[PDB]
Design a protein around this ligand. Sequence first.
Ligand code: NA
Ligand code: NA
Length: 137
Amino acid sequence: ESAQLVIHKKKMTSGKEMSEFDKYQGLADVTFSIYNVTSEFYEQRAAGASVDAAKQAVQSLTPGKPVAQGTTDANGNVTVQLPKKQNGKDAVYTIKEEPKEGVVAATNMVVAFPVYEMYGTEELAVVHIYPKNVVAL
Ligand code: NA
Ligand code: NA
């Protein structure tokens, strides 16, 4: 009933691990805070938003206390576990990078369960993400 979310923080110059990103240095000691936006997603949906629009909307929301937080290790990685469901519904989370001196923070990202490899037929129990700031890139 929980999935692992593996967050890879890269200094940038599918849902599965992507070897392409190994060209970039991993950044240690970066904290990510993960917020439950499940209710907010379903509200957007009930108001007629598409799945994509609903995700885009809740991307800017960080309601309440983070359900999880993790700080990257020496290689730039951290795993957190997240419930696949919240209040009986397929869960949606907003992932926020905490500000850190000398680091360009990623834009907030949304992860909506279940996750399929981008879509394949097998649900992922391990989801890999690579938060980035495209405007900065
Ligand atoms: Na998804
Ligand atoms: Na990044």
